[PDB]
Design a protein around this ligand. Structure first.
Ligand SMILES: OC[C@H]1O[C@@](CO)(O[C@H]2O[C@H](CO)[C@@H](O)[C@H](O)[C@H]2O)[C@@H](O)[C@@H]1O
Ligand SMILES: OC[C@H]1O[C@@](CO)(O[C@H]2O[C@H](CO)[C@@H](O)[C@H](O)[C@H]2O)[C@@H](O)[C@@H]1O
Lengths: 270, 270
């Protein structure tokens, strides 16, 4: 009675919150939780897999998009359950996640309602060979669904880091003439980067830039101004993923509701 | 070949940094790392221990002071190496750590050089039945070694949380008439709580209160003003500990140096 969790080496604090949920469901069901990290080296990846098989895990919960297909296949082929959390990793397996389009669309809805038209997505916005650019694509769809045009849509960044937020409006764009009035930050720390870059250059959020972040973890509460955020229920995602495994005997996608918490980082332009 | 790491369910971000160092050393030596979390429920602790025994781990690295003695004894009695990190858990086992007294005394030295006499320790300052009040005792020793008196020594708090920092100067002392000019925060988040409580009540750091934190993780760089801090080398603690396990052919304490990084959160009162 052991389940494994594969966590990327480089992660936001979302993982810890998911783990808290997994743990409370595992503990009350008589299972124990084995946590292992996954880097980008295919040979270390295979060792990690030998660790999962050797501890005879019943299930493996995947929190990383960098999981090689062969690991998913090999686990399934050993009759181990594989479930992905916060991401749709393979058509072969079930997933528990917040609904990405609904999250993004709720933010765009709100920003447009507050009078914003020129809006940037800042954070993980890159196109790649093997990973869907989920947030970039949803942002663009939502903006165009709202009858805005390419000229209103701005993008910056390759990851969810503080530094990406900070650099976006200092070296990515001209901080004195930002061409957008609002930024959607793909993670909380990106929002914190944006706040500090503005403050460090004689400007203030939200007067000079409105910000909404995705995740709603503790950084949004300790930021000043406090950050408006889409709060994900990471612990519920963890609980529901474990429950799915426990209740199992067709792959399924379960969407966990989110909510937009309004704090102090958005200005009404109307 | 597998090694375990036992992490408290409630932890600062220091654990991930330790684990980064453990991870790089385990990888290069052909071991795999299993991470497990420990609550304060003794039955759950025991179930976990059976997860360490039955994974036939070669070593267990302990990050938490809440480890029951029976767990350390049972692991040693099964010929498993046990090494504690950042804390001296038991006289029976080796430890790798920053030197606590030197960290504390480095801060007190500096604040006194900067003209401060009335100084608070804010954060984990409580006395208990089973756990040494390490920082409380070191602060008092260092202050008195510098020929300051009990009337110059102020203490607040029971843990390393943001909330403890925030409440210290709102419920703990009168924010308009603080009896100390500087606070030593026992973790970075406690410092951030102090900054926000001051700012939220119309005050300014460092003019109205000087702050120095212990740990020197990312929050100290994100804070405005940037926090003066004693930076611990958490990855190196992890690396050195794993290497101690790999080299073993009697219990020792290995101390890893720290550095006081002077930033923008301390006023020179001279
Ligand atoms: O941009 C979304 C994209 O990034 C990943 C991590 O690579 O998202 C994880 O991290 C985000 C920031 O903390 C979370 O908001 C998200 O829920 C989580 O999955 C990918 O998983 C995702 O496709
Ligand atoms: O106050 C020191 C005391 O607290 C513990 C945690 O209970 O310290 C850990 O967390 C601190 C704050 O992040 C770190 O500065 C410290 O290095 C780490 O050990 C105990 O271990 C320690 O005795």
């Amino acid at each position: 009675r052991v389940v494994g969790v594969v966590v990327p080496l480089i992660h936001t604090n979302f993982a810890d919150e998911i783990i808290k949920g997994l743990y409370e469901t595992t503990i009350s069901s008589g299972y124990e939780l084995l946590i292992t990290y996954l880097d980008e080296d295919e040979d270390h990846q295979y060792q990690v897999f030998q660790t999962l098989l050797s501890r005879q895990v019943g299930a493996v919960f995947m929190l990383s998009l960098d999981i090689p297909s062969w690991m998913i296949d090999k686990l399934l082929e050993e009759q181990i359950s594989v479930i992905s959390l916060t991401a749709l990793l393979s058509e072969q397996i079930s997933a528990v996640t917040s609904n990405e389009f609904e999250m993004m669309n709720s933010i765009v809805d709100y920003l447009i309602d507050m009078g914003h038209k020129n809006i940037a997505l800042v954070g993980d916005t890159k196109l790649t060979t093997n990973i869907s650019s989920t947030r970039r694509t949803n942002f663009i769809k939502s903006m165009t669904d709202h009858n805005l045009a390419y000229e209103n849509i701005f993008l910056y960044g390759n990851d969810h880091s503080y530094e990406t937020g900070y650099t976006s409006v200092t070296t990515g764009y001209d901080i004195n003439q930002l061409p957008f009035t609002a930024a959607i930050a793909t993670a909380d720390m990106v929002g914190q980067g944006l706040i500090n870059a503005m403050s460090d250059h004689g400007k203030t959020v939200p007067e000079d830039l409105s910000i909404v972040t995705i995740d709603g973890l503790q950084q949004t509460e300790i930021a000043r101004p406090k950050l408006t955020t889409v709060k994900q229920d990471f612990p519920e995602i963890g609980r529901i993923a474990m429950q799915l495994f426990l209740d199992s005997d067709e792959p399924q996608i379960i969407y966990i509701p989110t909510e937009l918490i309004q704090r102090d980082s958005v200005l009404n332009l109307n």
